[PDB]
């Protein structure tokens, strides 16, 4: 059901390798073994970016079809993933959460951070696990940016990236935002790249 | 697991899935059966025979290519021994241990193992007695069996 | 040492369904595994299964659809008088209206509904539901 236009394209495979997403974790994991392509010498595992890409598309496919675009919740408590998920929130409806998730957000209707999303997106399942876990109490699906070593528990449809840091987290969120805008939305002819620089999603700090 | 110890070891031969073959060998079984009986008259057991054949001569396994397992062959040619080489070695060990127990009576571990060995022997002999490879009595005896190895 | 080998089969099956697996490797195989698997298939409690040939006792790989709660063996295999089959089905089956006690009779391995219709009895074998 996926047209040949949806195929990888060399432009995108450039951004990913430039962003170094394909570089994977040394300790792999049993559930993340399919996303491995091959291991480098000196113990560095090469993620299969075509599987990276296709998942990203399937992920962006599910963000889409959520009837109200604000319900989709992008969560990062990591610094690298913070300015990323704010931008994803600005383009797509997507009410975000950066830094502290605070517990009792999906449970505990009396709290001020209360949400009832119909989807959750998570940069790091390890660091964000509070959100994944609460998610599992309310029947909420979850998208996850995962490395090779990441908790698979209560996460549907993971996107293998890098997630140790640098540009990969920014890219996968950038590309995520790009593809949900092409799907439904208005971008309309994915043939042409994006006006928006991918460096808008990134970590800042000084 | 192990009978007389706690060992769970699985170390064993995996016999290939083949009835026939190796497609390459084609050395004409009566040619190997000849080599079988030669080593038989040379004073070898079926066990060390099929190893010598497997190491130097090819001969993956003699049940294949000759249609008959090694011991059976020695019997049809009449080289079959009195007590099976099964038993022969157990009684060999048992006698070899008891000789050690005679000069050292203070070795209790030796006294322990001799029990284990002779237990194995009476079980084995019962079997061979049931299927009538041994006479209806037989019954390994500690004093007498020293000559049964020699 | 192995004793039943049916009881190892229905165990690996019942263990796998519960862990959510869709397929199970059985070993060894035997005519009674086959016949049991057969009465289980023909009511739909498993998918198809495929015997493997190793030159010794065989293996089996069975495909599990879910929908099976427990498949289990009764050891020892008790002689079951014909009226007692009612009494067996009451104990170990979840309701009168479904589930199967499976016997072994001179008329062949079957379930108790068949044996009821064929008016036959013998040693009980296991259950499935």
């Amino acid at each position: 059901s996926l047209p040949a236009t949806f195929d990888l394209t060399p432009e995108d495979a450039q951004l990913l390798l430039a962003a170094n997403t394909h570089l994977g974790a040394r300790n792999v994991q049993v559930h993340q073994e399919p996303y491995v392509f091959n291991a480098r010498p000196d113990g560095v595992h090469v993620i299969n970016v075509g599987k990276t890409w296709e998942k990203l598309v399937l992920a962006a496919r599910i963000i889409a079809a959520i009837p109200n675009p604000e319900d989709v919740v992008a969560i990062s408590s990591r610094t690298f993933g913070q300015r990323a998920v704010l931008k994803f929130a600005a383009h797509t409806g997507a009410t975000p959460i950066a830094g502290r998730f605070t517990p009792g957000s999906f449970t505990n209707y009396i709290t001020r951070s209360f949400k009832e999303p119909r989807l959750v997106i998570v940069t790091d399942p390890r660091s964000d696990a509070q959100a994944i876990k609460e998610a599992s109490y309310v029947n909420i699906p979850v998208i996850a940016l995962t490395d090779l070593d990441s908790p698979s528990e209560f996460v549907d449809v993971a996107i293998p990236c890098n997630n140790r840091g640098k540009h990969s987290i920014g890219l996968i969120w950038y590309l995520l935002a790009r593809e949900v805008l092409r799907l439904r939305g208005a971008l309309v002819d994915r043939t042409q790249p994006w006006s928006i620089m991918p460096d808008l999603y990134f970590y800042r700090d000084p | 697991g192990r009978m007389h110890s706690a060992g769970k070891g699985i170390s064993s031969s995996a016999i290939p899935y083949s009835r026939n073959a190796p497609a390459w060998f084609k050395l004409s079984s009566e040619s190997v059966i000849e080599q079988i009986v030669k080593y038989a008259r040379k004073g070898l057991t079926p066990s060390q025979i099929g190893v010598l054949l497997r190491d130097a001569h090819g001969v993956t396994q003699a049940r294949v290519i000759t249609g008959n397992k090694i011991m059976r062959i020695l019997k049809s040619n009449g080289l079959a021994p009195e007590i099976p080489e099964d038993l022969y070695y157990l009684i060999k060990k048992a006698v070899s241990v008891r000789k050690h127990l005679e000069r050292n009576r203070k070795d209790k571990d030796a006294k322990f193992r001799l029990i284990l060995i002779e237990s194995r022997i009476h079980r084995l002999a019962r079997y061979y007695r049931t299927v009538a490879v041994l006479p209806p009595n037989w019954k390994y005896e500690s004093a007498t069996a020293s000559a049964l190895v020699n | 040492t192995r004793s039943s080998v049916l009881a190892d089969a229905l165990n690996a099956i019942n263990n796998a369904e519960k862990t959510g697996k869709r397929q199970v490797l059985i070993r060894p195989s035997s005519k009674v595994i086959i016949k049991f698997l057969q009465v289980m298939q023909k009511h739909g409690y498993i998918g198809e299964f495929e015997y493997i040939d190793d030159h010794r006792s065989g293996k089996i790989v069975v495909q599990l659809n879910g929908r099976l709660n427990k498949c289990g063996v009764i050891s020892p295999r008790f002689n079951v008088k014909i009226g007692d089959i009612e009494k067996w089905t009451a104990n170990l089956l979840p309701a009168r209206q479904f589930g199967y006690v499976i016997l072994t009779t001179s008329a062949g391995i079957m379930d108790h509904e068949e044996a009821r219709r064929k008016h036959v009895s013998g040693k009980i074998l296991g259950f499935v539901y």
Partner: protein, 81 residues
């Protein structure tokens, strides 16, 4: 995991598995053909052979046994099968 082809596992993981743990068990041992240059005679030795093998004559050597594959001695040629 949770659904897989047991009837057709990959030949990469079936090769790394233990001898008896293959879908159907089978030996990992091979056989050789060996000549020393001093005789034209061919001798076929089993890879793991426990007996120190000589060719038909001359008592050179062929292999010496170990806990693993027999060790072929010095210069010799060995083909497979």
């Amino acid at each position: 995991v949770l659904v897989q082809d047991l009837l057709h596992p990959t030949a990469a993981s079936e090769a790394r598995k233990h001898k008896l743990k293959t879908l159907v068990q089978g030996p990992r041992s091979y056989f050789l053909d060996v000549k020393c240059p001093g005789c034209l005679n061919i001798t076929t030795v089993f890879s793991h052979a426990q007996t120190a093998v000589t060719c038909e004559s001359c008592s050179t050597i062929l292999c010496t046994p170990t806990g693993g594959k027999a060790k072929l001695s010095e210069g010799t040629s060995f083909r497979r099968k």
